[PDB]
Write a protein that binds this DNA or RNA. Structure first.
Length: 15
DNA sequence: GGGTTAGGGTTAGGGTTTGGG
């Protein structure tokens, strides 16, 4: 639950 | 525009992972 984010790989994220 | 992932797009919710705000 505390790790639901993650921030999927190169996908719009942190250009 | 901008923020975890962070930009765009219009739209306020959506959308690669995604909800607002």
């Amino acid at each position: 639950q505390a790790q639901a984010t993650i921030s999927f790989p190169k996908r719009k994220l942190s250009w």
